[PDB]
Design a protein around this ligand. Structure first.
Ligand SMILES: [Mg+2]
Ligand SMILES: [Mg+2]
Ligand SMILES: [Mg+2]
Ligand SMILES: [Mg+2]
Ligand SMILES: [Mg+2]
Ligand SMILES: [Mg+2]
Ligand SMILES: [Mg+2]
Ligand SMILES: [Mg+2]
Lengths: 206, 217, 87, 25, 97, 96, 129, 81, 121
RNA sequence: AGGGGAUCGAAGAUGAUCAGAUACCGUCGUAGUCUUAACCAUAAACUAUGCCGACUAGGGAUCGGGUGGUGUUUUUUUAAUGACCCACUCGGCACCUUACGAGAAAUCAAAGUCUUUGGGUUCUGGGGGGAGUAUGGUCGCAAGGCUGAAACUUAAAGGAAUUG
């Protein structure tokens, strides 16, 4: 189906290993076992990064299939993903919601933050649980940046990645944006790396 | 007049969606009763109960009136609406809106041979709300709606000609009984039968086809 | 279904969940339809051309959609070595 | 009237009914 | 109706545990249902320590402590504000502090 | 198996259980005991005849307040005394 | 103790089907179970099933196509005449057009329509739709 | 998981399972040839013996029964099968 | 005793929203400019609104005030948001990897400059 | 019926309190509390949840047994064994989350796999009282237990939850 130049190139694996996206939780929940390439001594479970790359590319194909990019919605209440979702918003259509989700954003058509998206990407199914719950009320597919412990309820596409490291969250959102742009007339040639680096997606103190 | 605030109402107003069956097929949530008014103009309503409910207070009992409303064309659609309000007229109007917003399809079928148009249900169905269980059984032609007046009126508004009804529980709780019946008729399109086993190409929703004139900027 | 002399009489023929083959009801608002853009040479989206799946609200409410979607996408060639039959 | 005390009172009436009957017997 | 899954006690697998006597009123209490507290007090005070350090041989000798496990009936624990009646959701919380 | 036996050969148990438990019904108990013939003013019949012994003024139960104008009757076929209401405005004058 | 291996098998299939499983294990796999599964298979209510041979009573893995609404046992196996098959179908089957009542006859284990056209009758095993 | 090969489970999963609860139940026990300190006569010892198994030369002990696998007598060598 | 009602707080909020450049830190000119940019039916209410506007401008001079967004602060919001380091933090500083991760990359069949290390148990 | 009879303590005494107090509170105190040999056979004898069997979801802790780590630890420095750690497994007392599903709800992994109603089997209930009364029988030294109505009377009694 894929040609594939879409295999995990060793420079992309280089970024994923450098962002510690493979360092998973110590308690894998039963729907997240397929994404586990063995534990480590001292308990950390390694995520199979190639499966992260395949799920990410599938997620970007789902995003690219959405006709209007502005009704792709990306959610991150966690600060570690707030800049990443905003940058994903700036580079794609990607109507962003960073911070509080304001219960009633998908229902309650009279709220000022009322959106009617075609797809929702969340940084954390635990922290953005209200948005996932509201998605299940109005037929919205959900992609989520999931660790091995995060729940998979009403999550259709799970990208297996570290949910704790800001580099991991910033990289996955940056890679998702890069792949989405590659799969349309915005990053015309797939071989050469993107001009902007994964760092501007990372949260910064204070 | 009416200016849509949702994508579905915007498409229905523009005429890109012309039947409510597309809304059923793609499970699109309905949040504006003007969509139902546009797509099903021949929709008749009926108030089935107005009973008061009271709330004890520091000073006496505050009374509101709860209206149960059933809408439906006699050709395969009904809606149920429950609304309590200060005034009976207000509860009735808002019940009519809620009833229209909840409009569901029903699967009508043949009791025996498929001669003519469907006249009954295609399957035995049950619904439950509170203690009340309402069971609908397909009935032969000319049987009529063998049901109590309230359930009979809901089925008449649905378009069923012949049906058998069995009830259990405190059926005098009218709102529970009507809800149980509304569930049972809603289950008609949930029940999988061998003539629905055939695979289908899984169409594309008009929310995607007409995404251009939806989501107005 | 269809009457004596043809004439399909169904208000509509509902969609079926691409995972469990359950009928997706009109009120199943937790059910989703997922479009995956088909990709030509050198990685392009081909708008309006999707591989489509439908997931029942039950599967999503059971936390099974991600695994089910892995299996269907792999069976359709979208994924390569994500889902495994034996476990 | 507590149930166990009504039981106790009924045992007293029964205990004396079975004595007047034995007496009248 | 039923108030608690652990009816009011901690007994699932016994039938009979043993009685204990309330320290406040001598009421007989199944030992698992009794409200138990551990009073660890200074043998003197929180304020006469300096006096006893000044006016005693054996500089800072031991400061011994007094240990006693108190058993309370439900009534005496509530009336002494040891357990402090709680809301429906908050009574399910078993944490001490 | 939700209680009751289900064996193909448990007909005796089921019929005896039903026999035992029909005694919990009011009508079945009364009919099989023959209480209408035995313990009832009318010996199981729909109507009876009697002689007016005396006119009574029965004070109605609360919250009502009225004199209900009944008669004590001694039944011809039994000799039992019954109280019968005399229904209408007046009509106690007709009874004597 | 285990009293009906067929009741246990059909319960396992029902509870698997209701939760959405594509497969189910069955133990211990009588031949009546096998014939019952074959009647469900020939009408499309299950898929392909496998008999695992342990040396005691075997097991079965059944593949499920998602089209089974309910398979059940009727215990006790009531004696059924020709003329009271239709009352069992009326009591058990959702509609007159689809669904099958499974019988065991000296002509074999079969559905009620094959029983009608062979003009044979017997005991009732169960139903499927 | 909702779709899995019940006929071909992983060997790791089967090894993890109870002996009665694998696809076809079987024993996790084995038999051993044991060579005693004294002589080189072959005696076959069950893994979960329950007998204080002795030989001809060292006619005292080779294994001590336990609640599970027997323990060899600290001076023997053994080979499975 | 001097808590401001939402009518004052909302009016001052909106005034800062759409008139921040025109406003100052001085109440005298702030009330003189409330006269022309807003229609207030009372001199006392206008004084309160301009006083709370001046108070929020004083707060704005030291860090942003939550809920209040004007052009002069949002432009420097994206100015700070577009910060890009001179060298990556995910580029190689000399790739420390342990045993299971090394098995991961070799199962993937990718050749990368790894460096296997041992972790104390 | 013997023995024992420290303690506490139906009865009783007595001091209080109060309108009264033959109750709560105080001090005594027989029976009893303990034991032996016989009785009795009842408790909110409760998980108010019969037993046997199968299946349906996730998790961690814990008790007993087992299996496996070139895993720690003391004893000669480490062998082993013990104890502990980790990972599994069978059995058990339970717990937590969720609500598939159930329920009137409270709530419930059984109280689920029920009008899509059937795995086997035992017991019990059929509005509230009268009444666990009367009568007969039977057991018991007795207290009492088991079995157990009716005449009559009545529009409610009751369950769970909501607002006050
Ligand atoms: Mg209470
Ligand atoms: Mg007990
Ligand atoms: Mg029975
Ligand atoms: Mg009893
Ligand atoms: Mg009981
Ligand atoms: Mg235990
Ligand atoms: Mg009755
Ligand atoms: Mg009764």
């Amino acid at each position: 189906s894929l040609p594939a130049t879409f295999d995990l190139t060793p420079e992309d694996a280089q970024l994923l290993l450098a962002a510690n996206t493979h360092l998973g939780a110590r308690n894998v929940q039963v729907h997240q076992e397929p994404y586990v390439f063995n534990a480590r001594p001292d308990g950390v479970h390694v995520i199979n990064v190639g499966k992260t790359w395949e799920k990410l590319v599938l997620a970007a194909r789902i995003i690219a299939a959405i006709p209007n990019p502005e009704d792709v919605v990306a959610i991150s209440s966690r600060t570690f993903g707030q800049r990443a979702v905003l940058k994903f918003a700036a580079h794609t259509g990607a109507t962003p919601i960073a911070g509080r989700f304001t219960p009633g954003s998908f229902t309650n058509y009279i709220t000022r933050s009322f959106k009617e998206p075609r797809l929702v990407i969340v940084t954390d199914p635990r922290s953005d649980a209200q948005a996932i719950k509201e998605a299940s009320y109005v037929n919205i597919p959900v992609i989520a940046l999931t660790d091995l412990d995060s729940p998979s309820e009403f999550v259709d596409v799970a990208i297996p990645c570290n949910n704790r490291g800001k580099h991991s969250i910033g990289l996955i959102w940056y890679l998702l944006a890069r792949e989405v742009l590659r799969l349309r007339g915005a990053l015309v040639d797939r071989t050469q790396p993107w001009s902007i680096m994964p760092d501007l997606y990372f949260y910064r103190d204070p | 007049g009416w200016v849509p605030v949702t994508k579905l109402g915007r498409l229905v107003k523009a005429g890109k969606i012309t039947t409510i069956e597309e809304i059923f097929l793609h499970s699109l949530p309905v949040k504006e009763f003007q969509i139902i008014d546009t797509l099903l103009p021949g929709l008749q309503d009926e108030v089935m109960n107005i009973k008061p409910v009271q709330k004890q207070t520091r000073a006496g009992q505050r009374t509101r009136f709860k209206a149960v409303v059933v809408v439906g064309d006699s050709n395969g659609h009904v809606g149920l609406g429950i609304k309590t309000a200060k005034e009976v007229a207000g509860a009735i109007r808002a019940g009519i809106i809620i009833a229209k917003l909840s409009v569901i399809p029903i699967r009508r079928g043949y009791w025996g041979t498929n001669l003519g148009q469907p006249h009954s249900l295609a399957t035995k169905t049950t619904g439950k709300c509170g203690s009340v269980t309402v069971r609908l059984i397909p009935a032969p032609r000319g049987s009529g709606i063998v049901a109590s007046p309230a359930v009979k009126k809901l089925l008449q508004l649905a378009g069923v000609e012949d049906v058998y009804t069995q009830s259990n529980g405190k059926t005098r709780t009218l709102e529970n009984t009507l809800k149980a019946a509304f569930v049972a008729i809603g289950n008609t399109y949930g029940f999988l039968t061998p003539n629905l086993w055939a695979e289908q190409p899984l169409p594309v929703s008009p929310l995607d086809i007409y995404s251009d004139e939806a989501s107005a900027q | 279904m269809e009457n004596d002399k043809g004439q399909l009489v169904e208000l509509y023929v509902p969609r079926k969940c691409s995972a469990t083959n359950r009928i997706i009801k009109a009120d199943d608002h937790a059910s989703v339809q997922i479009n995956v853009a088909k990709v030509d040479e050198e990685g392009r989206a081909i708008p309006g051309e999707y591989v489509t799946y439908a997931l029942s609200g039950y599967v999503r409410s059971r936390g099974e959609s991600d695994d089910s979607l892995n299996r269907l996408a792999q069976n359709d060639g979208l994924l390569k070595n994500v889902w495994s039959y034996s476990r | 009237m507590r149930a166990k005390w009504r039981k106790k009172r009924t045992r007293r009436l029964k205990r004396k009914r079975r004595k007047v009957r034995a007496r009248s017997k | 109706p039923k108030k608690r899954a652990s009816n009011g006690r901690n007994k699932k697998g016994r039938g009979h545990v043993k009685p204990v006597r309330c320290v406040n009123c001598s009421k007989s209490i199944p030992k698992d249902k009794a409200i138990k507290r551990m009073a660890i007090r200074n043998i003197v005070e929180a304020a006469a320590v300096r006096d006893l350090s000044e006016a005693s041989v054996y500089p800072e000798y031991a400061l011994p402590k007094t240990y006693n496990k108190l058993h309370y009936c439900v009534s005496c624990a509530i009336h002494a504000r040891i357990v402090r009646v709680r809301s429906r959701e908050d009574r399910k919380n078993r944490a001490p502090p | 198996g939700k209680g009751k036996p289900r064996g193909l050969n448990s007909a005796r148990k089921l019929r005896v259980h039903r026999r035992n438990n029909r005694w919990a019904e009011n009508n079945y108990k009364k009919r099989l005991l023959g209480t209408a013939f035995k313990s009832s003013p009318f010996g199981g019949s729909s109507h009876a005849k009697g002689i007016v012994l005396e006119k009574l003024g029965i004070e109605s139960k609360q919250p009502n307040s009225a004199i209900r104008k009944c008669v004590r009757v001694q039944l011809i076929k039994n000799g039992k005394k019954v109280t019968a209401f005399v229904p209408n405005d007046g009509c106690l004058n007709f009874v004597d | 103790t285990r009293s009906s291996v067929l009741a246990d098998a059909l319960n396992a299939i029902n509870n698997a089907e209701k939760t959405g499983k594509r497969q189910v294990l069955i133990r211990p796999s009588s031949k009546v179970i096998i014939k019952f599964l074959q009647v469900m298979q020939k009408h499309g209510y299950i898929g392909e099933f496998e008999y695992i041979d342990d040396h005691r009573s075997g097991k079965i893995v059944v593949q499920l196509n998602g089209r089974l609404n309910k398979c059940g046992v009727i215990s006790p196996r009531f004696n059924v005449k020709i003329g009271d098959i239709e009352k069992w179908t009326a009591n058990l089957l959702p509609a007159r057009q689809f669904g099958y009542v499974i019988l065991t006859t000296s002509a074999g284990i079969m559905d009620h329509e094959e029983a009608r056209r062979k003009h044979v009758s017997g005991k009732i095993l169960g139903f499927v739709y | 998981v909702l779709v899995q090969d019940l006929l071909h489970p992983t060997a790791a999963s089967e090894a993890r399972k109870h002996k009665l609860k694998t696809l076809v139940q079987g024993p996790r026990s084995y038999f051993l040839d044991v060579k005693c300190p004294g002589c080189l006569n072959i005696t076959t010892v069950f893994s979960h013996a329950q007998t204080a198994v002795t030989c001809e030369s060292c006619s005292t002990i080779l294994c001590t029964p336990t609640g599970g696998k027997a323990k060899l007598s600290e001076g023997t060598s053994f080979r499975r099968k | 005793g001097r808590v401001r009602t939402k009518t004052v707080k909302r009016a001052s909020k909106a005034l800062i929203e759409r008139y921040y450049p025109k406003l100052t830190l001085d109440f005298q000119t702030n009330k003189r400019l409330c006269d022309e940019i807003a229609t207030i039916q009372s001199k006392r209410l206008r004084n309160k609104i301009a006083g709370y506007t001046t108070h929020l401008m004083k707060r704005i001079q030291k860090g942003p005030v939550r809920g209040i967004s004007f052009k002069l602060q949002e432009e420097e919001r994206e100015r700070k948001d577009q910060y890009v380091p001179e060298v990556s933090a995910l580029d190689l500083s000399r790739l420390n990897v342990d045993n299971q991760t090394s098995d991961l990359v070799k199962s993937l069949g990718l050749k990368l400059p790894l460096s296997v290390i041992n972790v104390s148990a």
